[PDB]
Symmetry: C3
Subunit: 346 residues, 3 copies
Amino acid sequence: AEVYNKDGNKLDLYGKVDGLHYFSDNKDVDGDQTYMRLGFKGETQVTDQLTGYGQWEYQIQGNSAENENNSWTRVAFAGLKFQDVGSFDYGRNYGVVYDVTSWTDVLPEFGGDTYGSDNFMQQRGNGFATYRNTDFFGLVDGLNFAVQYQGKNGNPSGEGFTSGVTNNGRDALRQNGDGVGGSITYDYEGFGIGGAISSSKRTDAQNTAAYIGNGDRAETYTGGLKYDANNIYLAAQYTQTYNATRVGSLGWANKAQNFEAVAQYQFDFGLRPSLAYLQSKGKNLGRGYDDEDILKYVDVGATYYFNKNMSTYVDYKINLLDDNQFTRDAGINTDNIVALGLVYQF
Amino acid sequence: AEVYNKDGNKLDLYGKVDGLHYFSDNKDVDGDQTYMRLGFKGETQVTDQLTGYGQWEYQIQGNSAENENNSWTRVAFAGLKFQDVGSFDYGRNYGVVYDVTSWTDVLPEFGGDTYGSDNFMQQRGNGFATYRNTDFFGLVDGLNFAVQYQGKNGNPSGEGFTSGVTNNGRDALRQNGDGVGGSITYDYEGFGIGGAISSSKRTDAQNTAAYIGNGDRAETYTGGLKYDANNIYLAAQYTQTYNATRVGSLGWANKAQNFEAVAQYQFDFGLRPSLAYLQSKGKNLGRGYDDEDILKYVDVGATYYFNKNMSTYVDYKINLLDDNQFTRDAGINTDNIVALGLVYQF
Amino acid sequence: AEVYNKDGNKLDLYGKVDGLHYFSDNKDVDGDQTYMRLGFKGETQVTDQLTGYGQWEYQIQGNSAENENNSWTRVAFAGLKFQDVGSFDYGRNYGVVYDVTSWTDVLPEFGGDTYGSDNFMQQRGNGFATYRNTDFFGLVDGLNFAVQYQGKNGNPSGEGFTSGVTNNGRDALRQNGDGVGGSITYDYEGFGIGGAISSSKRTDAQNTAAYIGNGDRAETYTGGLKYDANNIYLAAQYTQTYNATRVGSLGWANKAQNFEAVAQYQFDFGLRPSLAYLQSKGKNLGRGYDDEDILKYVDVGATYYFNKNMSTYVDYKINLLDDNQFTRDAGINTDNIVALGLVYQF
Ligand SMILES: [Cl-]
Ligand SMILES: [Cl-]
Ligand SMILES: [Mg+2]
Ligand SMILES: [Mg+2]
Ligand SMILES: [Mg+2]
């Protein structure tokens, strides 16, 4: 909701409360999943061509008791945009791989989980410096590209580590070294095609015998297709990763091949059914695991939009993984999940 | 404060800062108690009859040093309301027993503590699905009823528990199995009369030898009366509970009888003195405790309203509990407390 | 940003996102330092002479992974102001010493660090009761004074302590006993001169073998000068402390002498270069340390203001401390730092 617009500065204060419940035999996910998000998007006109902006978004869990608080920053960045030349921002933001993989990240509740957060340049993460160019300097409508750098996020400070430390250090599964990435998308009428590549130095803490998927760099190669016209939405993405896809708690996949596809239809009266399939196939994983499915599920659901501020949904995760030694070892969910949600937003 | 109202959506952003200090011989409550609350209530018009809404409220303590953060979510829910039929909402909300007991929870600082938060269906808690009918299809002015369900909130995940786990699990004093409850209130002119009932399954983690008050289910039965007119506020509530009332850290009371009464007057010049009495009498407690007072105090206080946005208050808790073995074991406060508060709100 | 002004009540919702990166050989400070702040300031007109107000300010780090949250309350207080008589507020707030020392806390990133937070009455802290008078009861334009009390903030409750506990207790380095302080400042045309004194009881937890600088009270004496006109900003402050200045993790300085001076110029086109010198010198530190430099650096930087809502800066801390056993023992940084920041604010 635009709560301020005066003297060249605008502030949008936005958010949502999602009253959400999961039903599953996996009791680690089963039960109340209520959460809220809150954010702001501000923009200031410096000149006719130059605009400044800032964006921040925060999630606060609404399913805990009052003696605990589970909350986190999703994004937090500041930037400058110059008409027909480009934009630059720095902060906690999305990796440029998500420019393409976000196209299938449209399910009512599930989806978008062949990758995670703080997972190299694949989704949300710290220390992204991002250049974006829309419509190729204004010369080619629908052609967008982006170039991105991510600074190292290493070992925790003040804990006796003698190398690889950064001020904002963390556990090895969420670390990264210096990284570079780029994306390109082209949309013409209903159709969209896109590609993205990222390459990040892996840290010394990540490359130990404690974790599968050792290697000098974490790399991803992604291609995507889209159709978004005439009340239909179709999308698919394929990603091949090296030492980049997490395998539960075990570390990373030496190689993974990830695939997501989605089909949706929007009825005039507000109902939007959705069908999706997601898989992540791990190769040469190590420790005698050889090849294993990391993720495999069909998703069927629907959202009903009352209007722009209110919706409700059902989502059914049909989990095709089987309970075996590998999934137990990695802590990967193999159970079905049904989610029921009622969402107010502003 | 309403900060947005446009095209049928409204957003109220509200909060307060309470500069607050306790004086007590009990050093665990003595000192700075400063805090703030923030919240939003949003509503969106779907049709002339149907409205969607959401509410979120958060408390952040203002009395800690900067190397820590003590904050929590009070409520977080989304809902639908249909004109002359009813409403439904889901999330963290108040239990329906509070429809009646809230009537005496009107003291400047203290009060409202014959029960607590995350305490079956008695006050705030997770996973409430709440159905409400106001004015009986608009055919009986002032008559309201509600029926409520609470889903299980069990053992924490990822801690080696082999049963009773939920995604949002917690310590046993704040757990609950599935519950159902209901409330009826009638208000004619200044007068009010009300009743409520709740029945919750108790979890296995709650029914161990480590806690007093073992039982299959927690039940509560409440009656209340109110008078609110001519600058006079009077209210009283009586509640009988079974395996539902906490006895400090010891567990729960096999049976408890709770009573609260308040008298308040509003002077034209802004002063509102308040007198209250609360007691909770436990019976058949176990471990040789037998019958014991869980709570017993007289509260005398006053609030001065400068206007609807600024006020100051003093509240004096004259604590009639005596220091004995039982209160020592349970960690129940037996000392008096004086609170002094200065409050800005919007 | 003023988001509400209606019927005598006013609310300013303000904040900023600082996309920020440090470059340093010290890996404990090196890396992404992105953060955001959010706050509100509210005021209500009670009469033509009396105004009520509240303020709250919060910082949320934007440089961490989503599995943790590093945030805190900077300030949270409520108060009343009566025209030509004075103001009183209570809560988490700034010590009156900062009335004078704030005059040199104007550097683009560094500065303000011969003292810290929760550091007796020197900067932000809990339980301050503060009286202020502007223009000496309206009789002397530009003459301001302040008198302040801070309540004890002691040992944590529930941790087995038998004396010195408060409800909001914390670690010894952030404790304080009861304190009193005052400041006076006179400002006329470009110029300013001012003084402040504070005296706090130190707690028993602070006077143990674990900490250097044992003593009965923490005392500070500060003088300061300022010129602020004709696009020029000059300021200097000198403070003499006893058992009040922290020496990294080691405890406090029996005696310290602190000095800060700054010179800035504002070019019409938006650039504001800055030069500063800071030092803190400890004497009779004990434990064989004798006299030692606690802090010593020159700061050269510049901020470029695109407008009132957008800015960017570079700040270069040239650290004149040498690495020795003392700085290593204390965890005090001796390496240079370059900070680069891009800031959106509203
Ligand atoms: Cl222009
Ligand atoms: Cl937290
Ligand atoms: Mg399965
Ligand atoms: Mg007593
Ligand atoms: Mg040095």
